[PDB]
Amino acid sequence: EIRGVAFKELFRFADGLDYVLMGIGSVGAFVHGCSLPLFLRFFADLVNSFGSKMMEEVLKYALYFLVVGAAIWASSWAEISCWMWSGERQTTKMRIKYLEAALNQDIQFFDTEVRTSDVVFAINTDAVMVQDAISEKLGNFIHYMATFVSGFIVGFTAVWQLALVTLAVVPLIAVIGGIHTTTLSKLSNKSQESLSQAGNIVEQTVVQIRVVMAFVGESRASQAYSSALKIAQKLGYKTGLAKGMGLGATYFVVFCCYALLLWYGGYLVRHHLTNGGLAIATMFAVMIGGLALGQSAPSMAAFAKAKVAAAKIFRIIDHKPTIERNSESGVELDSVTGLVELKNVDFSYPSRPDVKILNNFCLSVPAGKTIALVGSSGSGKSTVVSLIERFYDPNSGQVLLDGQDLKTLKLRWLRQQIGLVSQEPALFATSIKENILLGRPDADQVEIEEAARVANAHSFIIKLPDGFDTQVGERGLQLSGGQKQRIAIARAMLKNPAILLLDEATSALDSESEKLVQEALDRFMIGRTTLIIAHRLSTIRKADLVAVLQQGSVSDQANSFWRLAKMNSPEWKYALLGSVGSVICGSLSAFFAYVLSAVLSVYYNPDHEYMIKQIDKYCYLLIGLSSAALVFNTLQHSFWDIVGENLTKRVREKMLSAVLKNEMAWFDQEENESARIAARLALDANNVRSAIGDRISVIVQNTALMLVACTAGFVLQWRLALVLVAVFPVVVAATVLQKMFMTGFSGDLEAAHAKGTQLAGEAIANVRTVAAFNSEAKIVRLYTANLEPPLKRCFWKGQIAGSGYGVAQFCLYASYALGLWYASWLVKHGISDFSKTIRVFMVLMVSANGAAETLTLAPDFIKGGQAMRSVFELLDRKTEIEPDDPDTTPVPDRLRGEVELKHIDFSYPSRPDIQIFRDLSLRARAGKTLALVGPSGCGKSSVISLIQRFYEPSSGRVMIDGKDIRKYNLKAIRKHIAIVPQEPCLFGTTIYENIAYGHECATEAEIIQAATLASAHKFISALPEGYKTYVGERGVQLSGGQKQRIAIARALVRKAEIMLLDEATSALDAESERSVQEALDQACSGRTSIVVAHRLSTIRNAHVIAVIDDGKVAEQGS
């Protein structure tokens, strides 16, 4: 465990405006806290002048009443509004600083101790925790502490002995608070770690959603999510028990102190030290102070959790990169020529330090000559590029640029002078114009068009209906395989480099397109040096020099609450128990007041023996009620917290199931992206937990207190005015809370922050891409621009919450003061008695304090309405393609494999103007392989997407074994289909689990057999941990050939009747490609295949050869 930061450390992001907002909020909280005890003492001093003509007194007291009401209104408004706005400002600044600190970390930091889900969780949940600490909760804590201090001061003014003996309660409260905060901080640390793991599971599931549904992995993902959430719910159970114990102990100590105060006051009255009224005022003040201490628990609860979260964030924020770019003092060579050398480079990756990738590696790329880096799969090559880009510093060697060590000069102008086309083109979620513009932000439109033209990208871009502004793709999945690669080539070529690195730039392209791109590059590489990694002889022939790499060298209720209750029925037992506890607790509060007020009339009896006996009896009653309050506070808090934990866990499971049940058209939307979906789920769960589950107990307790106050008013026959004043707080609280909830339940602008979260997710998922193009500052600027609208919306919400709290406080104070005036007027005139009114008004004060505690929950209700609307909008949505229709034609156990497409007319939901298929009739024979060929955008992968019902054809019929796939069970039919994705990314797990993802249960021997049949066993066994090696966030800690061989092994261990396959032989050496192709041909004999090929030599015995020309039925015979 890591120790949390100091409380002061929470305020390192405050500026002058934040300081003045915090000061105004603190002044308002202090004045609001002192308003009540000074008001009571002022009435005590006002009684005499009220008894003592009348019109002048009434007018003066009315104007003083108006002044005090205005002061209370302003103070209670500021205490909420200023604190909310200041907390939001500091939280936004801290999020921006966290993103900026994370973005300029080393590359080795992102495959070691941070993931994309980790940063998303830090931006969302930990930041909300820190905000809740520095938001209006701090203002409430200051208000309660001011109330306690004011009560002690006025008690000291009235009776100094009683105030002094009251002052002995603070050490016990301090000890209880310290113990409770320590336990809560540790439990919250563990719970937050578990929740981060669960969020990682969710994000990884959504990112690879096509692979997840293709291999029927929704159930496994849901089970893993539930298993992760079980730990969090157990820690929540423990947290609720700890909170119950703390609140019970605090109430027990406060009530025992009350009884001791009562007995000591009786002793003082026995002598001639103090009279009745002074003890009355002191009892009132001490009661208010104890109630304030009781209500100040949620602030202390949030403080420790947010201290832990802020420690977690500040660990990343204060972390300094080990590369240590020499931005202040670098060489900054002026006229770079192009001579780049690797001299005696000994390099081993930080993730696997034992494996030495390069030993004594020497390679001199000349000033203006091209080097073709031929070599084996998983042997240098892409690592060498990572050395030139300064992704990793060489461990025991040197990298030189024009005879200058790269570590002695800043890497900013390096990456500005290097144009990189990586193995996997990492495209962002913006438009393709912004993706191309990443190379040079300050470029004209004509320059962008020229860069696209030379990179052979203009033809397919101008054909798009939206042109260059086409905003498609999260990982580029809304473009074809070659389109995103050509866009990456255009992006790299726009930034005119002196050194150009092409790590398999051609890779997956059509023959004509590949020739055009390579010729344009050749006429583009005349004056600049280039390092090219390519396993195709076409580029090698044109290359100037060739280097062979071997062995690392060179050779409302109706729609929100009742639906939750129906969903969460099998907890109404626990809730009921907790409910009664809360109710009981509230009763004691009222009851306690009554008892104390009764003692207030015993003090005046001259009979000392009878008075002493009454004092003793009431002291025993108070001790019994104190013990009961202890027990029932513990019970109510523990059970309400277990109810909240069950609520949140069931909500999370239901939301994840709803997300995973949807179709591709849903996932191909800007709102329904992986980082945004994960952030939505996490924020919704956190809001329905903290703002609803943690407030139901206090809501029902205060409601019960107010109702029992009204019931005692009816039983004891109070006047109609008194019961009206008692009822008024209930109506005010109900109206205010309903208004805040409806404000929350109607409208939002969280999508502005959701865009920032998604931008951070893309930036962290593509740290190599953002680093190579020096786009960290651009990402930070876009993040700040996205975060401003949430800042202003939260400003407005804080304004309305402060106004509501202020008006409610003013109404309560006005009602109480008018009641006080009426009661004193009744007593003076003798129309009513005295002791009865005293009990009436003590109970009234307790009820009003409970109502204020209820009113304190406005922002929580607003965010609870937000969360409820979000979760129910997610749940209500119904999918277009149901993953499993119960009433379907059964799938035969031995599927023949007669997959066909008849008159298929298909248009993607996104960009629906383009008609991908116009009357496409493709047929695959039973058990025979079929090859799909054509241009890049002809739709070869669209056929694969149509086979698995990712999207439905508009007017086409896709047929399986002579039966429509629509009338089959989608989950059942998907178990007989095995695919390999076009760009085979892996999950954030081991090789063993990645391969085992293909089949439900496949023990160990089957996994080994699949690995051998994919010719992947050799390198996996050569790894230090074998099949248990962690492969990275998306398989980043592996080469392309190894990743694709692992994907092939997974598709093989699926052992399906219809292996769709694809161009899975790319990114593989000629020998490796031949071995994999021979093994696949041997394994797939007798089973139908729909393999697509870009190199026609691979499909030598593919039987039927089908071309896709004009998106229609082209030649199919051969």
Ligand SMILES: Nc1ncnc2c1ncn2[C@@H]1O[C@H](COP(=O)(O)OP(=O)(O)NP(=O)(O)O)[C@@H](O)[C@H]1O
């Ligand atoms: N971040 C990383 N952590 C650990 N190992 C890594 C990492 N990145 C790459 N490797 C390993 O580096 C080894 C060789 O370097 P690499 O650059 O992947 O080779 P390559 O020859 O370019 N592969 P390929 O493109 O498929 O032909 C592979 O076995 C990888 O598993």
Ligand SMILES: Nc1ncnc2c1ncn2[C@@H]1O[C@H](COP(=O)(O)OP(=O)(O)NP(=O)(O)O)[C@@H](O)[C@H]1O
């Ligand atoms: N989700 C999507 N939304 C919109 N268009 C899409 C989407 N997915 C694919 N496309 C388009 O579908 C067309 C064909 O792409 P694809 O189905 O990958 O064909 P392909 O022939 O397999 N490509 P390639 O591997 O490069 O040869 C392209 O114009 C894509 O931009």
Ligand SMILES: [Mg+2]
């Ligand atoms: Mg490579």
Ligand SMILES: [Mg+2]
């Ligand atoms: Mg494709």
